[PDB]
Design an enzyme around this catalytic site. Sequence first.
Site, mmCIF file in Angstrom:
data_model
loop_
_atom_site.group_PDB
_atom_site.id
_atom_site.type_symbol
_atom_site.label_atom_id
_atom_site.label_comp_id
_atom_site.label_asym_id
_atom_site.label_seq_id
_atom_site.Cartn_x
_atom_site.Cartn_y
_atom_site.Cartn_z
ATOM 1 N N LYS A 108 2.574 -9.611 3.858
ATOM 2 C CA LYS A 108 2.511 -9.804 2.417
ATOM 3 C C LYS A 108 1.045 -9.683 1.950
ATOM 4 O O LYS A 108 0.169 -10.295 2.581
ATOM 5 C CB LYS A 108 2.990 -11.202 2.040
ATOM 6 C CG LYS A 108 2.826 -11.653 0.618
ATOM 7 C CD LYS A 108 3.604 -10.892 -0.452
ATOM 8 C CE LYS A 108 3.260 -11.104 -1.868
ATOM 9 N NZ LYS A 108 3.953 -10.239 -2.944
ATOM 10 N N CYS A 115 -2.877 -5.643 -9.131
ATOM 11 C CA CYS A 115 -3.190 -7.026 -9.366
ATOM 12 C C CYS A 115 -2.533 -7.545 -10.661
ATOM 13 O O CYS A 115 -2.062 -6.819 -11.455
ATOM 14 C CB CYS A 115 -4.725 -7.201 -9.480
ATOM 15 S SG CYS A 115 -5.435 -6.227 -10.834
HETATM 16 C C1 LIG Z 1 9.671 -8.552 -3.935
HETATM 17 C C2 LIG Z 1 8.555 -7.512 -3.836
HETATM 18 C C3 LIG Z 1 7.290 -7.928 -3.571
HETATM 19 C C4 LIG Z 1 6.265 -7.001 -3.403
HETATM 20 N N1 LIG Z 1 5.043 -7.397 -3.129
HETATM 21 C C5 LIG Z 1 4.094 -6.490 -2.868
HETATM 22 C C6 LIG Z 1 2.843 -6.814 -2.246
HETATM 23 O O1 LIG Z 1 2.595 -8.020 -1.937
HETATM 24 N N2 LIG Z 1 1.964 -5.879 -1.943
HETATM 25 C C7 LIG Z 1 2.227 -4.555 -2.202
HETATM 26 O O2 LIG Z 1 1.404 -3.697 -1.847
HETATM 27 N N3 LIG Z 1 3.415 -4.128 -2.779
HETATM 28 C C8 LIG Z 1 4.298 -5.080 -3.019
HETATM 29 N N4 LIG Z 1 5.521 -4.674 -3.500
HETATM 30 C C9 LIG Z 1 5.784 -3.247 -3.732
HETATM 31 C C10 LIG Z 1 6.499 -2.600 -2.545
HETATM 32 O O3 LIG Z 1 5.611 -2.627 -1.373
HETATM 33 C C11 LIG Z 1 6.838 -1.127 -2.766
HETATM 34 O O4 LIG Z 1 5.596 -0.439 -3.042
HETATM 35 C C12 LIG Z 1 7.794 -0.921 -3.987
HETATM 36 O O5 LIG Z 1 8.800 -1.971 -3.991
HETATM 37 C C13 LIG Z 1 8.411 0.450 -3.969
HETATM 38 O O6 LIG Z 1 9.198 0.647 -2.799
HETATM 39 P P1 LIG Z 1 10.834 0.529 -2.851
HETATM 40 O O7 LIG Z 1 11.324 1.577 -3.818
HETATM 41 O O8 LIG Z 1 11.249 0.750 -1.422
HETATM 42 O O9 LIG Z 1 11.146 -0.896 -3.333
HETATM 43 C C14 LIG Z 1 6.574 -5.605 -3.624
HETATM 44 C C15 LIG Z 1 7.882 -5.235 -3.918
HETATM 45 C C16 LIG Z 1 8.905 -6.138 -4.041
HETATM 46 C C17 LIG Z 1 10.285 -5.669 -4.362
HETATM 47 O O1 LIG Z 2 3.427 -10.017 -5.947
HETATM 48 C C1 LIG Z 2 3.743 -9.194 -6.847
HETATM 49 O O2 LIG Z 2 4.171 -9.371 -7.990
HETATM 50 C C2 LIG Z 2 3.577 -7.744 -6.446
HETATM 51 N N1 LIG Z 2 4.710 -6.935 -6.745
HETATM 52 C C3 LIG Z 2 4.653 -5.581 -6.582
HETATM 53 O O3 LIG Z 2 5.689 -4.898 -6.801
HETATM 54 N N2 LIG Z 2 3.530 -5.024 -6.085
HETATM 55 C C4 LIG Z 2 2.397 -5.765 -5.750
HETATM 56 O O4 LIG Z 2 1.420 -5.126 -5.374
HETATM 57 C C5 LIG Z 2 2.408 -7.138 -6.018
HETATM 58 C C6 LIG Z 2 1.178 -7.964 -5.830
HETATM 59 C C7 LIG Z 2 0.100 -7.615 -6.851
HETATM 60 C C8 LIG Z 2 0.496 -7.814 -8.105
HETATM 61 C C9 LIG Z 2 0.518 -9.104 -8.703
HETATM 62 C C10 LIG Z 2 1.002 -9.309 -10.014
HETATM 63 C C11 LIG Z 2 1.439 -8.228 -10.779
HETATM 64 F F1 LIG Z 2 1.876 -8.414 -12.114
HETATM 65 C C12 LIG Z 2 1.382 -6.996 -10.232
HETATM 66 F F2 LIG Z 2 1.864 -6.002 -10.978
HETATM 67 C C13 LIG Z 2 0.913 -6.756 -8.921
#
Ligand SMILES: Cc1cc2nc3c(=O)[nH]c(=O)nc-3n(C[C@H](O)[C@H](O)[C@H](O)COP(=O)(O)O)c2cc1C
Ligand SMILES: O=C(O)c1[nH]c(=O)[nH]c(=O)c1CCc1ccc(F)c(F)c1
Lengths: 313, 313
Positions: free
Chosen positions: A44, A131
Amino acid sequence: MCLKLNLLDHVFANPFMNAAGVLCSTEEDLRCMTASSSGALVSKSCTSAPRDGNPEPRYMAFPLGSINSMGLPNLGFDFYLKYASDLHDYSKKPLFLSISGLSVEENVAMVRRLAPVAQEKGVLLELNLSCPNVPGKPQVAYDFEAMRTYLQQVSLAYGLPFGVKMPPYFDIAHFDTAAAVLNEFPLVKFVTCVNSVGNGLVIDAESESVVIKPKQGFGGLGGKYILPTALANVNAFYRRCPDKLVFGCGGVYSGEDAFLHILAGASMVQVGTALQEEGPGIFTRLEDELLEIMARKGYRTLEEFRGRVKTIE
Amino acid sequence: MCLKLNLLDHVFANPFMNAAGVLCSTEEDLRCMTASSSGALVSKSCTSAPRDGNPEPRYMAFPLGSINSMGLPNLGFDFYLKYASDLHDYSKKPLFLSISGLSVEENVAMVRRLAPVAQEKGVLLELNLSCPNVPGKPQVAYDFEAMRTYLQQVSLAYGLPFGVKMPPYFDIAHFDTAAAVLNEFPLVKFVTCVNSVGNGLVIDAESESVVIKPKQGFGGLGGKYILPTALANVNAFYRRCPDKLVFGCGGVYSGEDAFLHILAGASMVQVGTALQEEGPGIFTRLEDELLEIMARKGYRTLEEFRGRVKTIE
Ligand SMILES: Cc1cc2nc3c(=O)[nH]c(=O)nc-3n(C[C@H](O)[C@H](O)[C@H](O)COP(=O)(O)O)c2cc1C
Ligand SMILES: O=C(O)c1[nH]c(=O)[nH]c(=O)c1CCc1ccc(F)c(F)c1
Ligand SMILES: Cc1cc2nc3c(=O)[nH]c(=O)nc-3n(C[C@H](O)[C@H](O)[C@H](O)COP(=O)(O)O)c2cc1C
Ligand SMILES: O=C(O)c1[nH]c(=O)[nH]c(=O)c1CCc1ccc(F)c(F)c1
């Protein structure tokens, strides 16, 4: 036959891994990803200190994909670093650690600590440019001067090969400018395309209500909604960054979707929404499906078709 | 129960219209739109001179939506101005004319000539800002300084109420900046959100090929892919532009999709991809379906629910 590959001085059983943020927050999560058939795992995105994140509900999923405004909930960098240095079993698969500090200085301070562990254990850094919103300024990867500062500072502080997690772009000039920034940094060895499509809004017709509580219902989109956007970004950076690897993320639910990512240029293929919805069994299904499409086509290796998407004329 | 609207000093039988570019390029197209049950129509975005557009295939559709790089094929401004001045039957429904000049000067030249026809006949201008300017620069509405310049020059040249067609945005900062630009211009009376989600890439797995010829397969996305993005933009501009109307466009295939747009803040609801695929019969279906949802919920008019999406806590 087998989907094993070598990248970044590591060996991988197959190109699949979780997307950062999915199934990777807790020690339990990380152990479960390690036990899965995935080729790798990523932690994460973390901050220097622990965060609770946003109020619930903050994630919802639907037949076409997902929306989230998690708010960066995480156990803090010290936990993830401890997981990388003491708890991860490297014999099982490679580990990536995602960092998402709220300032350049916070990133720098984390990476300086990570570097010896990277050297000793081989953990890999993915730096997340996305962010929480700050009124009056754009997300870092959408502010090209800020992006260049982050990368210059992290590069200096870290000193080792790393990657960057990118939001999607939607404009050709933007692809050109972003790739030119990234290409200034020889230590950026991989680019992960894409993060969620920002600030979408899902509304429920029956209740007449948004479906997540933070941000008045606005949140990042994943899943089927975003596959053509993801492919576009993968290919655009594949074309523009010949000395880097590209990792594909977005809209992968099947071996066919993975195949498309690899055709567009992906070296690793990350799975978010579909992993959140199906669980870690998904990795055996994706592998089987990808090997079946390869066999049908006569491909014995990923390299035979990576980046080989055809254009018309 | 009724779908009637009165806005911009016009009366509309219902909120549905085509999206610019679909079923609106030729006199035959415009006559078809006029004959349909839609509440209004908009003409194909035009240039000063006729354009053939890009080589084919340049549009493709799939179960989740469409991709296009048409290249602005159109019959030229003089044809659309003649249609508005001489051919359109305004007793059937209102007409919007969309313009998409390739420089600010081309736009100014067209709106100067449109003005007297607007004033006399009531045709309504939609200025397309989700459009190229200088190659290597972002599209106009992704270049806030260029956008401001186009709006200052067209407002001075035209001198009458008009609206603007906007691309989607993905960052809160951009919603804030864009709406602030629009709110500098009192003559911008409606804002149509959204144009296509830019520069996506569809790949066919069997053929291992992109599906459109121009731009190495890259093109704008419409349809089911883009509904949450479209709702977000509608609501973001509805909240930020309280003295303007918002028209919704993106991902409308059903009365329920239209109801979501209207809850988000939409006045008019435009239909692109789904109209391209189903044909003009779609408008009777969308009207029936929206009326059925209104009857179930006890809503008698659109104003009872427009903009009334609920947020959590
Ligand atoms: C619940 C959730 C939390 C996520 N948290 C992060 C994160 O901590 N860091 C990040 O780089 N992307 C985060 N993402 C984005 C995912 O890594 C990914 O880029 C995005 O969901 C698109 O891929 P998908 O179509 O397979 O969901 C998050 C996505 C979801 C659904
Ligand atoms: O932890 C999240 O909300 C999150 N979700 C994503 O889909 N991608 C991410 O990279 C993150 C962490 C960084 C982040 C934290 C808050 C946001 F409003 C945002 F768009 C992105
Ligand atoms: C074939 C085609 C041509 C289009 N041409 C134009 C255009 O001339 N002007 C414009 O403002 N938008 C144009 N668009 C965008 C649509 O007006 C609409 O904004 C976009 O397709 C999203 O709506 P949808 O999801 O209903 O397709 C075009 C779309 C398609 C599919
Ligand atoms: O005619 C087009 O390609 C077009 N298609 C859309 O989906 N929306 C539009 O506004 C237009 C006209 C403007 C335009 C012209 C060329 C492009 F590469 C582009 F992305 C947009």
